């Protein structure tokens, strides 16, 4: 229900390959920082039944609260092993994920400088 | 009977449940005040660290669900925000008189008599702090500020390194001094641009004669030094030329493509030669700047920073005597820069800090700036220094603007609370009490002092109290007003000769802020809240 | 702290430690102490809890009330704890020992809060209790005279005083002559069985009576006894424990017979068995018969030919109240029915009482016994009137065995806090601060009797304060006249063990607990 | 005004002093006044509706099917199936009156409604509910005293 | 229905237990990379997330692929991580330094000691240590290339790099050396930007080496396009070749028949024009970061002129930094300035199955590229960060010529003129103070028990020698075993980095007890 | 030393300063831990007092046999110095009768 509209959110739900999925997804946020991957188990929902068991890995893409993308049971079109190039790659081509480094920290009344006498 | 969709509290219960949250709020920062106070850790839910002594970034950075402990918050925040100093003292104040007050009321005493003598109470003390327990700061010279930075930086991470750290920040509030009209000597903090960056040890923190830029050159070809730097401040886009939303390019004849595409880059080739021309050294630009531009400068062999941030680019051009420029056109349309619009500034240089690099704009002419680069041991230690940092610079704030400062460790709040206590007999009947629980109430900050110190707090305290009350009844002995807390030792010292000082501003605002949380709390004697 | 895969102590155990905890404490027993505060004092108000199966007790008294609590704290059960030993020692007073220890520890709260070692408020605690009490034992007023009307007033002003807080306090002088004459009564030990205490719904309080003798419900009357005459003007009363009905002689008997003559034998002495017990009954000289065991109709039928009343299934204890109160002997074999094992009563009749069926001893002229019949609107009526009568007959047993009295209306307690804080002037300084808290907690009696009265606490104080200042020892609170009086001469009174006993518990449960410094709760096994 | 007091301490601790205190209510003073009379005049003025000649039956159906027509109080209130505890205290007024007397069960009910519904407006007025029982008391003593007096024998 | 005045999921935690846990967290976090000090030091696997792979016995790279809870290791990984990135030594070293004192700091804790009087005393402890190891130490002279190999061989003597020392070393040194770079006054070695480290898997370790220039992965892209070059005049360019877009919307409209072919043939017409002015300096090749279209190649090619397109940017700085040429955006405004001479040769060549292009023949090159051959990927991803080690080591030295011994001498030496000076404090805290002194005999006793000698009979003697006047070169041998005085064995190390270690741990001990209540569960609130 | 509140797994109040009741009614897992309780319900079974200091001794041994194991002692060592030191104590402890 939060956060922005202009902001994509994906959400991945899953059961106890999960680990290289999660493992891509984590390479993804660290090369996305703007987008807020997140992840939520299925039995926490209390989805169907037939969910858990055909449909355990769910890529579910949120865009202002409408659903822009409900890539489900990625296993056959994705793969088992394929890295974190190959998952950037397929979600780009369909047009959903968005498009210097200081030394560790800048940000800190609005009097910002005057020398006017 | 109601009917109403939602709970109810009347009576004693919902005041006893107020006086509960601002007990809980004031006992969560209880333990960060004094010297000997500890800083607190704080995690998220997503695992970041964030370790602080201050006040108001505790009580901010915290869930608060109950409406009165969101008044002690915002009353933290608010104290913050007029003061900077004191965000601590003001909860632990405005919770002591509401628990006080809330005792009161439970003996049956109306509570519009405990406001109106709170009322009373805080008035005499304000007035009484003004006509006794203030010292001028005319006398006492540059120690004065090193002493007031100094007690301002004790329960910090830079505490023991305070000798240091209050000459960096008396430095640094001494250069940034301008006066305005009707020659008031004005302070802008916030212009001093804190710079943190982890690695070798708090010793080595530099403070900046000039100003420090958290951004490096775009391009690698540019030279990363200029010793005469004539900065030119802008505060447009340097890239290819397009045409506005109301203008097409539709063509008819094919020959004038290749004009229109070669023009269309020529424009800002262009107004980089004007910009050359006039001898800049050093461009600074809010916008972005693409290759070709990147190149142009490379050439020339001159400086061009991009996306430089708005608040760094004004403090810049006011400290070098540049002006910003939106647009280069003059008032006979036409596009010009004139060299009356460049800064100057005595060297500039990107300096490598910790596997990383940063531009310091060194001695800048016809107004002298500051900043300061901030060498911690990690992320959160450098950002608890520059959070005390920041608190010291507005004590020194406080301190220059009104020359008034008062005795540290308790003293003030002992001495108001005997003043108050034999004041309370002079007027009204059932106000009476309530000026003496203010009295009583305004002794919460040394016993904390004397219980983080872990020491006998009543002895201590009890000690205090008999040293005001022979100043305040002898009038040959007024040296004794400023005794304050010896916290090291636990024993009442002489503060103002041990140079504990602190602005008068502060313990008026807190008084103040905390005088009105407590009477609209106070005021509560009925609770509804609706299901949503 | 560290998850530790190898754990010391079981998974799931809680521990609070420190100040934090002990401040808790303290919250929570001003929690219990407020779910009593407003049943003090004549003005107080009774309190109604309903338990999981939906029965309802109202009571004004302070023990039922913490009892009907079902506290679990394990500080807070100390004051549910005092206020039983001080029922079980006392009788009255439970009210006043959690408000006074509660307010111990409110005053000692503050100093807690800023670091005070808790040994110190502890031997404070000690030192004060002691010179309170032998204030206390110093100041009380007593008589040495013997006179028996001026004894027998002193009885009736501490009954009344200990009554004039409940829903029978409007009828508390004659409930109060009827306690005192009832304890009077009493042989030496004034043990609370002796006073047989029925209840009887319907009729108002004044219809209630006290037997001079003992009175108990019919007991299963069997076929035949209405026949029984039901007035007597001289009757000799057979106190036994005997099963008068045909049976089998023992429950592993066996009879053996071949001949039909010995049967008819066998059967004809079970009868005469039967029989010979009745004939040596009724030659015995009674004409009441009462028995612990079944009387069976045979028997009925049998003593209504004679013109007897008898009656069976008699409780024990009111077998043991009549014995006490016509003078005979509870017997268990009927050969020898002398003279001297028979009771005796001066009339014997049985009455209605409210749609039941009461069987009355009255004219004994040496009994040691009594019996009240309560009478009321509601079952629990009946249950809070025996409950003051008990709390009146506790103080009246006490008053007998020591007539020292001392007023009150708070007045013991103002002269106690002004001895106290003189004391503490005199003292170094750091026990003086927890000596002048414990006497200024000592007032909270008389303030929380101001706030239920309606009346303004703060001037009441400062008036009673004043007074005892210059002068005066039994001046406390007067609610009808809105001020303060002298309640001794109001005959205000209270034995002075009562407020002996309340000091002393609730200084050793504001003792107890300032000094635990750790809470620890094993998790619970067999949750089921 | 219900879920007694929930505090969790000053300190974030547990704070636990009752069992299940948090599936008890709790009411006081005032606020548990005005609830009881209010349940005694509701009950007091059901009753009311069959007091004298002209009264009316009312129809006690009980958990079996069981129907039973009747016009006296107190057969009425012990059949009735009350949760309210001053309900139950009136049903046992009723009781009372009927066994010691045998009549008039149904005249205790309204009379004391109606005592209560007095009551009511001097609470609201400021006027302690003990100083209310006690003029209660000494007007019922003269009542009582006037009944005595205005009485007449009968062979 | 609770109420509540925090959040429901907000725990709150303080005392001697939020101190007790802390302290006991970074012991933990020390015990973790213990034995991963010393010559003598062992391999460890770290299974990544993503299913990679790290072998290696760097303290950094070990701390930094651990996911911690406890926010006190989040510290500690801080902590390394700014060792690494300040000096690029000394992780191992600052860490366990760090937990020694915060374990005797819990010692003093458990008795009525207030924190601020531990940090006090070890704040003027660490006054103290620096002072002593700019006493201690040696000045180096930079034209000596024999030293600064041996500094190099000191420093990476303990890592798995150490089977080829000579190699290593000489290759670190000349890496370093070529590319220092001095403009307008300004000395700057930039290590992270330019002397790139390429690694090809395959071939032998022997073979590697650092090339006089630059080397991509990159292939000519045309056939016909010239892949040896002996003298080129390499032109360097950042936009495109080819036909583009402009920026604003520029619709056509076409009624005459022949208006589109003209369209057309300008296209071929600009694309020519570009060419000739790329042409007019005469280069031999050219390089640009983006596309380059085939009727450039064409017209590149009819001049014998070899161009490689889509260069990374970084790539191409390097390349401007070895050969001494400029990038240039806009090809009309190239300069005889911006033409690339100073490459020796030039050379695309098949490495495996693969081609790779060569620049590595360039006169006085300020920009180089580490060609690492090894076993497999993971073998020269820790040669890798053993290269990054020794040239962080030798630009450490080149700016600070200070040199401190090494093998605990330094710390032995440190610690017992700290005890010497405590003897006059006469005070409360100098208890703290002499205890953090001695909590520096940590490394030399890491360095024993990690060698496997007897660690209490080589301590005592270590202690009693430097107890004389002229032993403070006297460490321990951490592949002997034995007391050795250590300008002889030669194990030096910078002072930069003694001091970085010992600030840093000395302020880890601080912040960490600065530190008595901890709350968790709140949302960031953003 | 301040009493303890102790709830056992019966909910049955405990307050006591007694090293070996707090022992008895806590829900001790960890074997070390049992086998200083039983070492302590030992010594009140032969004394009757001495319980807190058997546990304090035998802590303050444990902690600094864990110091002496950290600085380089091998176990056999400090069990052996341990003995020596217990006997050396018990020949001493006739000496300091009062
Ligand atoms: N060196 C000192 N000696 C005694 N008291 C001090 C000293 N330094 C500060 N104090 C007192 O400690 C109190 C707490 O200050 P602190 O809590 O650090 O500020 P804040 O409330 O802004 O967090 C101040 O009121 C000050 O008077
Ligand atoms: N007539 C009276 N006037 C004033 N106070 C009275 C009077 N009668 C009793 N009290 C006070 O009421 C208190 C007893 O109240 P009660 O609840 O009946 O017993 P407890 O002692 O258990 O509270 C005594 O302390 C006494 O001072
Ligand atoms: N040949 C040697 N003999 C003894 N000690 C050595 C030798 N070589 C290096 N050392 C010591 O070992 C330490 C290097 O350990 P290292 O594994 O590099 O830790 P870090 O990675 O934290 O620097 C240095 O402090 C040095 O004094
Ligand atoms: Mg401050
Ligand atoms: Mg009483
Ligand atoms: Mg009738
Ligand atoms: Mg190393
Ligand atoms: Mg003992």
Request: charged residues 25%; aromatic residues 4%.
């Amino acid at each position: 229900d939060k956060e922005q509209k202009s902001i994509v959110i994906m959400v991945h739900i899953y059961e106890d390959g999960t680990e290289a999925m999660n493992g891509c997804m984590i390479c993804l946020a660290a090369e996305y920082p703007a987008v807020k991957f997140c992840k939520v188990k299925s039995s926490v929902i209390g989805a169907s039944s037939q969910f858990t068991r055909n449909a355990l890995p769910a890529l579910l893409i949120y865009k202002g609260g409408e659903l822009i993308g409900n890539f489900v049971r990625v296993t056959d079109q994705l793969g088992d092993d394929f890295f974190a190039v190959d998952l950037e790659a397929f979600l780009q081509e369909f047009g959903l994920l968005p498009e210097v480094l200081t030394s560790v920290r800048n940000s800190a009344s609005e009097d910002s400088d005057l020398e006017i006498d | 009977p109601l009917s109403v969709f939602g709970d109810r509290s009347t009576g004693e219960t919902i005041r006893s449940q107020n006086v509960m949250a601002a007990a809980s709020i004031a006992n969560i920062v209880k333990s960060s005040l004094g010297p000997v106070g500890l800083d607190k850790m704080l995690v998220d839910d997503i695992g970041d660290v964030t370790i602080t002594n201050d006040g108001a970034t505790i009580l901010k950075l915290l869930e608060v669900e109950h409406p009165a402990a969101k008044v002690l918050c915002e009353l933290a925040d608010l104290q913050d925000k007029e003061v900077g100093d004191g965000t601590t003292s003001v909860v632990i104040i405005a919770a002591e008189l509401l628990k006080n007050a809330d005792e009161l009321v439970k003996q049956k005493i109306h509570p519009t008599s405990v406001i109106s003598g709170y009322r009373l109470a805080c008035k005499e003390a304000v007035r009484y702090i003004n006509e006794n327990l203030i010292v001028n700061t005319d006398e006492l010279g540059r120690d004065c500020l090193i002493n007031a930075a100094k007690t301002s930086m004790s329960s910090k991470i830079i505490g023991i390194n305070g000798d240091f750290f209050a000459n960096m920040v008396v430095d640094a509030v001494l250069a940034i001094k301008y006066t305005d009209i009707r020659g008031q000597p004005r302070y802008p903090v916030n212009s001093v641009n804190i710079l943190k960056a982890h690695g070798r040890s708090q010793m080595e923190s530099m403070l900046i004669s000039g100003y420090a830029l958290n951004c490096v050159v775009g391009s690698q070809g540019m030279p990363k030094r200029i010793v005469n730097a004539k900065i030119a401040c802008l505060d447009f886009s340097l890239q290819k030329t397009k045409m506005k939303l109301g203008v097409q390019v539709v063509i008819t004849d094919p020959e004038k493509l290749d004009q229109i595409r070669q023009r269309e880059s020529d424009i800002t080739k262009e107004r980089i030669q004007k910009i050359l021309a006039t001898g800049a050294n050093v461009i600074l630009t809010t916008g972005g700047i693409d290759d070709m531009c990147l190149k142009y400068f490379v050439e020339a062999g001159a400086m061009a920073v991009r996306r430089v941030l708005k608040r760094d680019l004004k403090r810049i051009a006011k400290a070098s005597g540049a002006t910003i420029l939106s647009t280069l056109a003059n008032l006979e349309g036409e596009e010009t820069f004139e060299a009356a619009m460049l800064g100057q500034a005595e060297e500039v240089v990107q300096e490598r800090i910790c596997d990383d690099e940063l531009i310091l704009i060194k001695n800048t002419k016809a107004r002298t700036s500051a900043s300061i680069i901030l060498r911690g041991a990690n992320d959160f230690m450098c950002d608890e220094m520059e959070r005390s940092l920041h608190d010291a610079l507005c004590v020194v704030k406080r301190v220059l603007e009104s020359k008034s400062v008062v005795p540290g460790g308790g003293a003030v709040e002992a001495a108001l609370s005997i003043y108050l206590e034999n004041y309370a007999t002079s007027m009204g009947s059932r106000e009476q009490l309530a000026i003496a629980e203010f009295a009583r109430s305004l002794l919460v900050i040394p016993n904390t002092l004397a219980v983080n110190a872990a020491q006998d707090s009543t002895d201590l305290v009890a000690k205090l109290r008999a040293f005001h009350n022979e100043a305040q009844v002898n009038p040959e002995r007024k040296n004794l007003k400023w005794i304050g807390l010896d916290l090291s030792n636990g024993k009442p010292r002489d503060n103002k000769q041990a140079g504990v000082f602190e602005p008068t501003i502060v313990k008026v605002k807190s008084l103040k802020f905390a005088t009105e949380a407590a009477i609209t709390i106070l005021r509560i004697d009925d609770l509804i809240k609706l299901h949503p | 702290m560290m998850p530790t895969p190898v754990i010391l102590l079981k998974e799931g155990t809680d521990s609070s430690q420190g100040i934090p905890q002990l401040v808790s404490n303290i919250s929570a027993c001003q929690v219990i102490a407020e779910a009593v505060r407003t049943t003090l004092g004549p003005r107080g108000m009774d309190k109604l809890i309903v338990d999981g199966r939906g029965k309802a007790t109202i009571s004004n008294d302070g023990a039922t009330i913490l009892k009907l609590l079902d506290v679990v704290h394990p500080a807070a059960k100390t004051l549910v704890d005092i206020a039983k030993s001080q029922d079980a020692e006392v009788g009255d007073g439970t009210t006043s020992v959690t408000l006074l220890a509660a307010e111990f520890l409110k005053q000692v709260k503050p100093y807690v809060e800023e670091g005070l070692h808790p040994q110190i408020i502890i031997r404070a605690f000690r030192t004060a209790t002691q010179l309170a009490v032998n204030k206390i034992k110093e100041i009380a007023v007593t008589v040495k005279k013997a006179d028996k009307v001026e004894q027998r007033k002193l009885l009736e002003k501490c009954a009344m005083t200990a009554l004039s807080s409940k829903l029978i306090s409007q009828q508390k002088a004659f409930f109060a002559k009827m306690v005192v004459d009832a304890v009077m009564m009493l042989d030496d030990l004034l043990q609370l069985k002796m006073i047989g205490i029925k209840k009887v719904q319907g009729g108002a309080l004044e219809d209630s009576q006290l037997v001079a003798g003992v009175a108990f419900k019919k007991t299963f009357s069997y076929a035949g006894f209405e026949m029984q005459p039901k007035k007597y003007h001289n009757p000799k009363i057979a106190l036994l424990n005997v099963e008068l009905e045909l049976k089998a002689e023992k429950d592993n008997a066996e009879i053996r017979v071949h001949t039909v003559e010995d049967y008819q034998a066998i059967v004809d002495a079970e009868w005469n068995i039967l029989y010979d017990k009745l004939e040596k009954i009724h030659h015995s000289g009674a004409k009441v018969v009462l028995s612990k065991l079944p009387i069976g109709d045979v028997a009925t039928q049998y003593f209504a030919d004679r013109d007897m009343f008898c009656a069976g299934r008699v409780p024990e204890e009111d077998l043991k109240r009549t014995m006490m109160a016509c003078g005979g002997s509870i017997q268990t074999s009927v050969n020898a029915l002398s003279a001297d094992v028979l009771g005796r009563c001066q009339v014997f009749e049985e009455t209605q009482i409210g749609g039941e069926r009461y069987n009355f001893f009255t004219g004994c002229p040496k009994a040691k016994t009594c019996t009240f019949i309560l009478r009321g609107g509601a079952e629990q009526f009946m249950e809070e009137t025996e409950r003051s009568l008990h709390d009146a007959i506790m103080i009246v047993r006490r008053a007998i065995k020591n007539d020292s009295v001392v007023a009150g209306g708070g007045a013991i307690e103002m002269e106690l806090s002004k001895y106290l804080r003189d004391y503490s002037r005199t003292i170094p300084g750091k026990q003086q601060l927890l000596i002048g808290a414990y006497a200024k907690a000592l007032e909270i009696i008389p303030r929380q009797l101001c706030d239920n009265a309606g009346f303004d606490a703060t001037n009441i104080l400062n008036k009673l304060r004043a007074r005892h200042a210059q002068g005066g020892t039994w001046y406390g609170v007067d609610i009808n006249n809105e001020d303060i009086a002298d309640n001794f001469e109001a005959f205000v009174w209270e034995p002075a063990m009562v407020r002996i006993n309340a000091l002393t518990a609730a200084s050793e449960a504001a003792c107890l607990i300032v000094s635990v410094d750790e809470t620890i709760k094993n998790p619970r096994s067999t949750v089921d | 005004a219900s879920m007694g007091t929930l505090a969790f301490d000053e300190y974030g601790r547990p704070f636990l002093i009752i069992k299940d205190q948090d599936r008890k209510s709790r009411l006081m003073g005032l606020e548990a006044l005005k609830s009881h009379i209010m349940a005694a005049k509701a009950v007091a003025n059901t009753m009311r509706t069959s007091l004298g000649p002209n009264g009316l039956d009312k129809m006690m159906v009980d958990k079996d099917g069981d129907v039973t027509v009747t016009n006296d109080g107190a057969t009425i209130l012990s059949m009735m199936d009350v949760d309210h505890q001053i309900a139950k205290l009136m049903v046992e007024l009723s009781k009372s009156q009927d066994d010691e007397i045998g009549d008039g069960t149904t005249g205790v009910v309204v009379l004391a409604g109606a005592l209560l519904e007095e009551a009511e407006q001097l609470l609201d007025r400021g006027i302690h509910p003990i100083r209310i029982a006690d003029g209660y008391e000494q007007a019922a003593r003269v009542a009582i005293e006037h009944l005595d007096k205005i009485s007449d024998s009968v062979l | 229905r609770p109420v509540l005045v925090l959040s429901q999921n907000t725990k709150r935690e303080s005392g001697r237990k939020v101190q007790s846990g802390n302290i006991n967290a970074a012991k933990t976090i020390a015990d973790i990379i213990r034995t991963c000090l010393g010559p003598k030091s062992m391999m460890k696997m770290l299974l990544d997330p993503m299913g990679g792979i790290v072998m290696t016995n760097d303290g950094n790279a070990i701390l930094r692929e651990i996911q911690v809870q406890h926010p006190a290791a989040k510290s500690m990984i801080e902590i390394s991580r700014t060792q690494d990135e300040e000096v690029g030594d000394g992780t191992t070293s600052v860490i366990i330094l760090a937990g020694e004192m915060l374990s005797v700091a819990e010692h003093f804790l458990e008795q009525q000691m207030h924190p601020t009087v531990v940090i006090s005393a070890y704040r003027k402890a660490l006054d103290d240590m620096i002072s002593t190891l700019k006493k201690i130490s040696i000045p180096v002279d930079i034209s000596d290339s024999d030293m600064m190999l041996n500094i190099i061989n000191s420093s990476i003597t303990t890592k798995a790099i150490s089977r080829w020392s000579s190699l290593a070393c000489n290759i670190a040194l000349d890496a370093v050396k070529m590319v220092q770079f001095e403009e307008n006054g300004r000395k700057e070695i930039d290590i992270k930007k330019y002397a790139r480290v390429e690694k090809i898997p395959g071939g032998i370790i022997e073979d590697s080496c650092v090339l006089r220039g630059v080397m991509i992965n990159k292939d000519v892209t045309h056939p016909r396009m010239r892949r040896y070059i002996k003298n080129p005049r390499i032109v360097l360019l950042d936009s495109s070749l080819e036909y583009k877009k402009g920026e604003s919307q520029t619709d056509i409209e076409i009624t005459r028949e022949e208006d589109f072919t003209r369209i057309l043939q300008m296209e071929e017409e600009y694309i020519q024009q570009l060419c000739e002015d790329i042409i007019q300096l005469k280069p031999d090749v050219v390089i640009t970061e983006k596309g380059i279209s085939d009727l450039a190649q064409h017209y590149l090619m009819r001049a014998n002129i070899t161009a490689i397109r889509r260069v990374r940017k970084t790539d191409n700085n390097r390349i401007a930094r070895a050969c001494g040429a400029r990038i240039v955006s806009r090809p009309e405004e190239l300069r005889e300035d911006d033409v690339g001479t100073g490459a020796g040769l030039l050379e695309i060549k098949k490495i495996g199955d693969e081609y790779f292009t060569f620049i590595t023949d360039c006169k006085d090159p300020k920009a180089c590229t580490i060609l690492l051959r090894g076993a497999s990927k993971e073998i020269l991803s820790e040669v890798e960060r053993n290269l990054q080690d020794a040239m962080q080591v030798c630009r450490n030295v080149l700016l600070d010529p200070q040199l401190v011994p090494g093998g605990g001498a330094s710390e032995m030496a440190v610690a017992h003129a700290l005890t010497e000076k405590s003897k006059a404090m006469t005070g409360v805290e100098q208890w703290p103070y002499r205890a953090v002194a001695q909590a520096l005999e940590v490394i030399p006793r890491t360095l024993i028990q990690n060698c496997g000698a007897s660690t209490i009979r080589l301590l005592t003697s270590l202690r009693a020698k430097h107890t004389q006047e002229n032993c403070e070169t006297w460490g321990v041998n951490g592949e002997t075993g034995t007391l050795v005085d250590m300008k002889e064995l030669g194990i030096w190390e910078p002072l930069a980095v003694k001091l970085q270690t010992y600030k840093t741990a000395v302020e880890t001990a601080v912040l960490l007890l600065r530190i008595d209540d901890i709350v968790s569960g709140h949302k960031k609130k953003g | 030393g301040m009493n303890k509140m102790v709830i056992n797994h019966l909910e049955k109040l405990f307050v006591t300063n007694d090293a070996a009741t707090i022992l008895r009614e806590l829900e001790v897992q960890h074997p070390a831990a049992k086998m200083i309780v039983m070492a302590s319900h030992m010594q009140e079974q032969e004394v009757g007092d001495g319980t807190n200091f058997v546990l304090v001794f035998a802590g303050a041994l444990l902690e600094l046999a864990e110091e002496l194991l950290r600085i380089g002692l091998s176990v056999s060592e400090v069990i052996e110095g341990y003995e020596i030191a217990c006997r050396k104590a018990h020949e001493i402890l006739p000496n300091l009768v009062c």
